[PDB]
Amino acid sequence: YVSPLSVALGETARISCGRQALGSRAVQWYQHKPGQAPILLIYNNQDRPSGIPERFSGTPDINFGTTATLTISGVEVGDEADYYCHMWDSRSGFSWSFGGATRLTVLSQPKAAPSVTLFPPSSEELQANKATLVCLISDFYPGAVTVAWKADSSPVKAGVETTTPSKQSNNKYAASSYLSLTPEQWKSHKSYSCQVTHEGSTVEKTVAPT
Amino acid sequence: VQLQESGPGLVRPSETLSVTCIVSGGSISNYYWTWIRQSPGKGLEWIGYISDRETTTYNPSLNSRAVISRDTSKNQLSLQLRSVTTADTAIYFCATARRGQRIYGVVSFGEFFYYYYMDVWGKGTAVTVSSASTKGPSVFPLAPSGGTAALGCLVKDYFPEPVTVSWNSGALTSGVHTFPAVLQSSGLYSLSSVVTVPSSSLGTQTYICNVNHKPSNTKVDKKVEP
Ligand SMILES: *[C@@H]1O[C@H](CO)[C@@H](O[C@@H]2O[C@H](CO)[C@@H](O[C@@H]3O[C@H](CO[C@H]4O[C@H](CO[C@H]5O[C@H](CO)[C@@H](O)[C@H](O)[C@@H]5O)[C@@H](O)[C@H](O[C@H]5O[C@H](CO)[C@@H](O)[C@H](O)[C@@H]5O)[C@@H]4O)[C@@H](O)[C@H](O)[C@@H]3O)[C@H](O)[C@H]2NC(C)=O)[C@H](O)[C@H]1NC(C)=O
Numbered sequence: 001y002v003s004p005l006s007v008a009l010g011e012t013a014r015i016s017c018g019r020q021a022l023g024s025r026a027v028q029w030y031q032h033k034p035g036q037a038p039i040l041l042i043y044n045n046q047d048r049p050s051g052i053p054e055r056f057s058g059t060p061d062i063n064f065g066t067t068a069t070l071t072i073s074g075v076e077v078g079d080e081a082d083y084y085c086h087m088w089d090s091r092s093g094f095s096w097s098f099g100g101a102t103r104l105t106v107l108s109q110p111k112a113a114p115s116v117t118l119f120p121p122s123s124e125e126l127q128a129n130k131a132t133l134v135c136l137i138s139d140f141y142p143g144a145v146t147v148a149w150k151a152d153s154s155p156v157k158a159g160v161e162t163t164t165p166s167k168q169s170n171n172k173y174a175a176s177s178y179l180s181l182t183p184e185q186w187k188s189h190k191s192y193s194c195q196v197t198h199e200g201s202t203v204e205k206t207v208a209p210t
Numbered sequence: 211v212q213l214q215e216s217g218p219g220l221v222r223p224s225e226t227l228s229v230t231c232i233v234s235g236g237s238i239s240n241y242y243w244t245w246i247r248q249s250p251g252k253g254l255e256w257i258g259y260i261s262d263r264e265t266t267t268y269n270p271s272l273n274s275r276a277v278i279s280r281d282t283s284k285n286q287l288s289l290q291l292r293s294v295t296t297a298d299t300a301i302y303f304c305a306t307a308r309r310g311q312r313i314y315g316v317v318s319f320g321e322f323f324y325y326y327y328m329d330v331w332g333k334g335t336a337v338t339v340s341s342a343s344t345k346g347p348s349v350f351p352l353a354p355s356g357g358t359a360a361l362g363c364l365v366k367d368y369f370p371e372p373v374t375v376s377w378n379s380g381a382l383t384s385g386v387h388t389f390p391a392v393l394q395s396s397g398l399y400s401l402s403s404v405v406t407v408p409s410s411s412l413g414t415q416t417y418i419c420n421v422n423h424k425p426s427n428t429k430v431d432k433k434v435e436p
């Protein structure tokens with residue numbers, strides 16, 4: 001239900017509505033960020049609610065040949081979201097569906113070095129006959145990442161749960177990795193290390209039982 | 211205005227989902243209200259709306275399984291979805307709908323139509339549909355680098371979301387980072403919430419993390435000590 005739109009940073013993005021109006025149209029443009037509340041960007045073909053920046057503008061229904069287009073001038077990294085085109089007209093009637101959403105992906109964003117934090121298992125966890133190591137990566141761009149675990153020289157292939165880099169608080173990616181072991185396995189090897197590969201670059205954090 | 215959603219978090223299939231929308235900053239009798247949802251992997255699906263005359267209109271795709279009601283005593287909107295299935299798992303938003311009249315000719319000739327646009331929304335409530343039961347989360351401390359150190363709380367083995375993690379209520383805001391939840395092979399979720407605290411602040415300042423899981427009705431305050 002998503003159409004990719006890879007636009008350049010600092011340029012104008014024109015989102016064409018997937019639905020073609022059959023006559024006199026009333027077009028609404030909604031902005032929806034994941035995990036947030038959808039925002040009403042444009043509520044009439046040329047109307048803009050209060051507080052909405054002037055960089056957003058729609059095509060008014062002057063003539064019939066005008067295709068509904070949401071214009072975003074000077075796009076920033078904070079404009080990456082889903083854009084819904086709620087279409088109304090005389091010959092379609094009540095349009096209950098929000099239509100296909102166009103997901104904006106701003107490009108040319110500067111690279112960010114990943115910040116990796118490694119936490120060993122807890123004592124209250126070791127006494128619970130379990131032991132999970134936490135590898136938290138944060139503040140990196142783009143979302144391409146490769147998390148690996150190494151028990152000293154030996155690698156670890158099973159027992160690894162890694163999340164998707166969905167986190168975009170400051171428009172930077174962040175993910176989590178969990179290595180589940182038993183207390184005997186945790187105290188067995190000398191040290192466990194989380195090796196994160198971002199843009200090919202390898203950063204490694206290491207912990208040990210103490 | 212301000213809108214807040216409340217839900218059960220988990221409903222077994224072949225039952226009745228029910229969510230509530232608390233409104234504030236304006237009267238409830240002089241506005242069109244509406245319910246909208248978004249399922250994982252699906253876009254926004256308009257559920258229905260209710261007018262100021264308490265005459266509701268629903269999406270014909272829900273097969274008339276939805277009922278929207280309004281209560282003026284508590285100024286709350288209510289949505290009930292009967293006979294839920296795995297597909298009904300979605301985040302439910304309540305919004306305020308405005309009706310605009312779009313005229314392209316003679317008003318007497320019916321050459322006009324009405325369109326609806328929602329201006330104010332709510333952050334939404336996450337309601338999952340599953341036959342399993344809610345499990346209380348286990349919270350463990352992660353004791354603590356450029357004059358600072360990482361101090362976190364690890365929430366594990368809970369089902370399902372939402373789950374809120376705070377740090378000393380609103381006293382701790384800088385450095386508070388709550389990473390996204392992981393979905394393990396067992397169907398259980400887990401997340402981590404870390405804070406970057408100056409090294410000198412350790413030993414003298416207390417940092418307690420408050421974890422709340424609404425579906426299982428659990429509230430735990432854990433203090434992390436280095
Ligand atoms: C035989 O007679 C017929 C009837 O007299 C006539 O039918 C007319 O046909 C024309 C075109 O053929 C149509 O023109 C179209 O009208 C629509 C509707 O415009 C009206 O409504 C909008 C919406 O107003 C709302 O919002 C404003 C705030 O923005 C509020 O104040 C308002 O209360 C509403 O809530 C409105 O914006 C329009 O106002 C514009 O125009 C007036 C003109 O007096 C200005 O004063 C005003 O500032 C503004 O510029 C207007 O009130 C319009 O949107 C289209 O663009 C299009 O122009 C007529 O609707 C239609 N009916 C009537 C009653 O006129 C036939 O054409 C005629 N045939 C022949 C051969 O003579």
Ligand SMILES: *[C@@H]1O[C@H](CO)[C@@H](O[C@@H]2O[C@H](CO)[C@@H](O)[C@H](O)[C@H]2NC(C)=O)[C@H](O)[C@H]1NC(C)=O
Binds near residue numbers: 063064065
């Ligand atoms: C009325 O119908 C004509 C028939 O085509 C329309 O004319 C076309 O309009 C589109 C608009 O994008 C142009 O690309 C075509 O080249 C036009 N074709 C011709 C043969 O003119 C016209 O737009 C319709 N509407 C009005 C108001 O005239």
